[PDB]
Design a protein around this ligand. Structure first.
Ligand code: NAP
Ligand code: NAP
Ligand code: A1JDH
Ligand code: A1JDH
Lengths: 291, 291
């Protein structure tokens, strides 16, 4: 395929995605707030447009890899007159509702809009491990599918432009919270003079087992949550809530951040106050859904 | 080995541990606040002691599998006169300083004390996947190591009775916080009518890759944290903090718990306020260590 592409935003992700698209035989025209940053991808065959307008006018497909959606408006507002007849593919983090309004902004300027959420770090872009969530108009996705697939295995979720964003934010909810918990635990262990080089392999070793620890003895958390079925015979909210209390207590004594473990503690407390101490830990979702 | 064992506390863990010890040829005498709960392990060859005193006097080794350390005091207070010359192995969650004081309480009553933290759910007890952290007097550990290994591969951390507890609390810090994040994300996706049966495999599928997504592009977090090395070339705190902001925003709009994502958000905010927006995410540990 030789569809000409425009890519705006040359952080690590933009640079890797440009390279992937070049390697697959696409002309790529790039633009960046900091043009010096384009030197690498220019050496690989990208063309540096001088202006956002020139960049947009060089592609059927305009991909954004920016910190947030405000950046999309910042860069494209001077170029709105050149959007008509093109597809904007925004591969940036923001809220679902910002995303939906941006889709409408695109339409108003005569363009189509696809939402994407890239689910791997830069070095994995364009590899068999890469995958990207997409939502928006099916015909628009299908038109550009072969081009986009170069970045990573596409997972089209449906018509709502906000849905791929919601999925990205949910994934990153788990990812960033997990990472914070690793740093929290590493700090906790640090207060007895355990180094991060010692603690992090222990912690990561445990994290590796989590899918299997969740499956043990025939538990199947998702379908169980859907059924309002939370049997506590292998672990109760009382018992795991006690541990959340112990983590808070240990954290208080350690002089470290209390907000993360207290949020977890609060999940258990709500379930107990609502009379479900005997239930499995999945019951915490009720109080999370309705605070 | 046929060392006689006493095990107090017959939740799922106590029952599984009793079974494992029986299968390895140990006499096990059990006691429980709710004796009816012992029926299963009695059918498998355990002897139900009538009283805590009788239970303690039947074993060289007294294992506790109780919700917290207060329970240990509740059950053993009437039996304190029978502790002398025995080893108490507490496999219960509590704070490190509660644990240390408990060790001294044991010594005062003429017993030795070992701290243990069991790192797998009940169905994995006694399997090749099982492991348990231990701390306390090395000679006491070495004496009972043969018996204890039946429950799971022992990981002795040193002399401080509080250290295996600190490690358990740190592990459960990661585990419970991760679980809370899964339910948080599942709730978030629920607000667009995505079922938990759909969302949880996606989220778990991402979590599966975390031990490897952190290694992409040659990152080695632990040693790097020890070296105060936080290069931001593949991901910055500014960019990941923006995503934390987006999760909070999405969560606010979704009507779900804000405390968990705001805790994570605050980790990023502190790093930026302290002038490290350009750094890798690991830098959040500084603000966690010193709130
Ligand atoms: N890094 C990852 O591992 C990863 C993984 C998947 C998804 N993502 C997402 O991918 C996107 C790109 O992230 P990244 O890590 O590659 O880079 P980043 O640090 O977010 O920077 C991306 C680009 O945004 C530009 N930018 C930011 N604010 C701007 C504004 N107001 N006006 C114009 N340009 C602006 C930067 O300009 P300058 O070059 O001039 O600074 C840069 O070119 C983000 O939305 C991120 O959440 C990242
Ligand atoms: N479940 C897991 O997957 C898991 C994995 C690793 C570690 N752990 C840890 O292992 C320990 C046991 O957990 P579990 O899930 O098997 O059981 P649990 O729900 O914590 O109950 C364990 C035992 O504690 C007893 N108990 C609680 N408070 C008591 C008190 N004040 N006086 C006397 N007995 C008291 C219960 O008595 P009754 O039988 O009369 O109610 C029961 O026998 C906990 O510390 C937990 O954190 C659990
Ligand atoms: C979806 O993957 C990411 C999103 C935001 C930041 C990061 C990633 C993956 C790799 C990493 O550690 C940094
Ligand atoms: C150390 O493993 C646990 C501690 C407390 C609760 C649970 C576990 C692991 C298995 C599970 O789903 C529930």
């Amino acid at each position: 395929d030789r569809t000409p592409v425009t890519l705006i935003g040359l952080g690590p992700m933009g640079q890797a995605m440009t390279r992937a698209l070049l390697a697959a035989g696409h002309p790529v025209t790039v633009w960046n707030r900091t043009p010096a940053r384009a030197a690498g991808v220019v050496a690989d065959g990208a063309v540096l447009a001088a202006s956002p307008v020139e960049a947009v006018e060089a592609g059927d497909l305009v991909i954004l890899s920016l910190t947030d959606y405000q950046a999309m408006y910042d860069v494209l507002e001077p170029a709105t007159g050149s959007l008509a007849g093109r597809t904007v593919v925004n591969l940036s983090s923001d809220t679902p509702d910002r995303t939906r309004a941006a889709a409408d902004w695109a339409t108003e300027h005569g363009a189509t809009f696809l939402t994407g959420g890239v689910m791997i770090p830069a070095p994995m872009v364009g590899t068999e491990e890469a995958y990207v969530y997409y939502s928006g108009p099916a015909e628009v996705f299908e038109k550009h599918r072969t081009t986009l697939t170069v970045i990573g295995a596409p997972r089209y979720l449906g018509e709502d432009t906000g849905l791929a964003q919601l999925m990205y934010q949910a994934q990153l909810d788990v990812f960033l919270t997990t990472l914070s918990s690793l740093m929290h635990a590493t700090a906790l262990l640090g207060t007895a003079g355990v180094s991060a080089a010692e603690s992090m392999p222990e912690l990561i070793g445990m994290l590796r087992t989590v899918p299997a620890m969740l499956e043990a003895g025939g538990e199947n958390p998702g379908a169980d949550i859907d059924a309002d079925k939370h049997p506590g015979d292998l672990s109760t909210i009382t018992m795991m809530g006690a541990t959340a209390d112990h983590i808070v207590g240990a954290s208080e004594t350690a002089g470290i951040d209390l907000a993360l473990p207290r949020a977890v503690q609060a999940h258990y407390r709500r379930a107990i106050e609502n009379g479900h101490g005997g239930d499995n830990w999945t019951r915490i979702i009720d109080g999370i859904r309705s605070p």
